Amino acid sequence: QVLRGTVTDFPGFDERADAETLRKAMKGLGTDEESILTLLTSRSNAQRQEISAAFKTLFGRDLLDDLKSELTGKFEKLIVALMKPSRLYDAYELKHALKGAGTNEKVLTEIIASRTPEELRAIKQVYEEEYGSSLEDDVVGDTSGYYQRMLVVLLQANRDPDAGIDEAQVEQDAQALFQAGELKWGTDEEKFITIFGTRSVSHLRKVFDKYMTISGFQIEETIDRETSGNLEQLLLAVVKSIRSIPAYLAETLYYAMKGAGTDDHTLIRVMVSRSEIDLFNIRKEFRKNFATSLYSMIKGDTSGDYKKALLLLCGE
Ligand SMILES: [Ca+2]
Ligand SMILES: [Ca+2]
Ligand SMILES: [Ca+2]
Ligand SMILES: [Ca+2]
Ligand SMILES: [Ca+2]
């Protein structure tokens, strides 16, 4: 489709005027969170970077250090996320899922499955730049088995082009997946990793259809979500992303709020990282799949300034 974000460049932007408002909001005893909230969610990421620059040229101060000293809580985490340069943000969040004891597999899967090969090539490059090390080495460092192998394949950013549907291979592949799926995805993993990882998106959507007509089922049905198995989670994310990235991300949001409490980390990461890409399309998938709006779901799951900020990111 045509991807539509919910945040665009503010017309009539003046980074100096904005820098002064933020300075005033912060200056002295207490904070005007409401003024910060509304300013920042109504400027695009590139404008926020122009505000930081102007804040340091006027005041000799660092805006992000200031925000971090003035704010707290989930509101702080949301604001700091917004302030990240768009080009770094996916990298940063991968770096945080990997760095330390254990791994945050959830974030690894989500970003690596739902970002396009072009996004991935850029994240790899920025990760190396920023963090000194290769994303691929750090992933191999943290993960094992076919989960690791399948991430590394996706990390090569080399899917076949969408050109010729070789309906002979479509039938072969669909049969291969039929077999493997009946076998609970636990045999011949090497076969399917190559099919999921390297075939073109238009091929694979053909495979999924063909599959269903062979089995009667949708290939997702042969996996169950809430329970375990990193490779299965990864398989499910890839199949959903091949179908529709905004649908898969809408579902990740739904489940970030569904149940006791919220996965605020996920809610923040998706709302921010997609705000200027496809968040509008995500809003429409959510509504049609989950028969409620994202807005009301956020409004019911969150509170305070953190909630106001998110509802202004979201829209309607
Ligand atoms: Ca203050
Ligand atoms: Ca206040
Ligand atoms: Ca703080
Ligand atoms: Ca680790
Ligand atoms: Ca909840």
Swiss-Prot record:
<dbReference type="GO" id="GO:0050819">
    <property type="term" value="P:negative regulation of coagulation"/>
</dbReference>
<dbReference type="GO" id="GO:0001786">
    <property type="term" value="F:phosphatidylserine binding"/>
</dbReference>
<dbReference type="GO" id="GO:0005925">
    <property type="term" value="C:focal adhesion"/>
</dbReference>
<feature type="modified residue" description="N6-acetyllysine">
    <location>
        <position position="95"/>
    </location>
</feature>
<dbReference type="GO" id="GO:0007165">
    <property type="term" value="P:signal transduction"/>
</dbReference>
<feature type="modified residue" description="N6-acetyllysine">
    <location>
        <position position="74"/>
    </location>
</feature>
<keyword id="KW-0106">Calcium</keyword>
<keyword id="KW-0356">Hemostasis</keyword>
<dbReference type="GO" id="GO:0005576">
    <property type="term" value="C:extracellular region"/>
</dbReference>
<feature type="cross-link" description="Glycyl lysine isopeptide (Lys-Gly) (interchain with G-Cter in SUMO1); alternate">
    <location>
        <position position="27"/>
    </location>
</feature>
<dbReference type="Pfam" id="PF00191">
    <property type="entry name" value="Annexin"/>
</dbReference>
<feature type="repeat" description="Annexin 1">
    <location>
        <begin position="13"/>
        <end position="84"/>
    </location>
</feature>
<keyword id="KW-0597">Phosphoprotein</keyword>
<feature type="repeat" description="Annexin 3">
    <location>
        <begin position="168"/>
        <end position="240"/>
    </location>
</feature>
<dbReference type="GO" id="GO:0042383">
    <property type="term" value="C:sarcolemma"/>
</dbReference>
<feature type="modified residue" description="N6-acetyllysine">
    <location>
        <position position="68"/>
    </location>
</feature>
<dbReference type="GO" id="GO:0016020">
    <property type="term" value="C:membrane"/>
</dbReference>
<dbReference type="GO" id="GO:0004859">
    <property type="term" value="F:phospholipase inhibitor activity"/>
</dbReference>
<keyword id="KW-0094">Blood coagulation</keyword>
<feature type="repeat" description="Annexin 2">
    <location>
        <begin position="85"/>
        <end position="156"/>
    </location>
</feature>
<feature type="modified residue" description="Phosphoserine">
    <location>
        <position position="35"/>
    </location>
</feature>
<comment type="similarity">
    <text>Belongs to the annexin family.</text>
</comment>
<dbReference type="GO" id="GO:0005543">
    <property type="term" value="F:phospholipid binding"/>
</dbReference>
<comment type="function">
    <text>This protein is an anticoagulant protein that acts as an indirect inhibitor of the thromboplastin-specific complex, which is involved in the blood coagulation cascade.</text>
</comment>
<dbReference type="GO" id="GO:0005829">
    <property type="term" value="C:cytosol"/>
</dbReference>
<keyword id="KW-0111">Calcium/phospholipid-binding</keyword>
<dbReference type="GO" id="GO:0012506">
    <property type="term" value="C:vesicle membrane"/>
</dbReference>
<keyword id="KW-0007">Acetylation</keyword>
<feature type="modified residue" description="N6-succinyllysine">
    <location>
        <position position="288"/>
    </location>
</feature>
<dbReference type="InterPro" id="IPR018252">
    <property type="entry name" value="Annexin_repeat_CS"/>
</dbReference>
<dbReference type="InterPro" id="IPR002392">
    <property type="entry name" value="ANX5"/>
</dbReference>
<dbReference type="GO" id="GO:0005544">
    <property type="term" value="F:calcium-dependent phospholipid binding"/>
</dbReference>
<feature type="modified residue" description="N6-acetyllysine">
    <location>
        <position position="77"/>
    </location>
</feature>
<keyword id="KW-0702">S-nitrosylation</keyword>
<protein>
    <recommendedName>
        <fullName>Annexin A5</fullName>
    </recommendedName>
</protein>
<feature type="short sequence motif" description="[IL]-x-C-x-x-[DE] motif">
    <location>
        <begin position="312"/>
        <end position="316"/>
    </location>
</feature>
<dbReference type="GO" id="GO:0070062">
    <property type="term" value="C:extracellular exosome"/>
</dbReference>
<keyword id="KW-0677">Repeat</keyword>
<dbReference type="InterPro" id="IPR018502">
    <property type="entry name" value="Annexin_repeat"/>
</dbReference>
<feature type="cross-link" description="Glycyl lysine isopeptide (Lys-Gly) (interchain with G-Cter in SUMO2); alternate">
    <location>
        <position position="27"/>
    </location>
</feature>
<dbReference type="GO" id="GO:0062023">
    <property type="term" value="C:collagen-containing extracellular matrix"/>
</dbReference>
<dbReference type="InterPro" id="IPR001464">
    <property type="entry name" value="Annexin"/>
</dbReference>
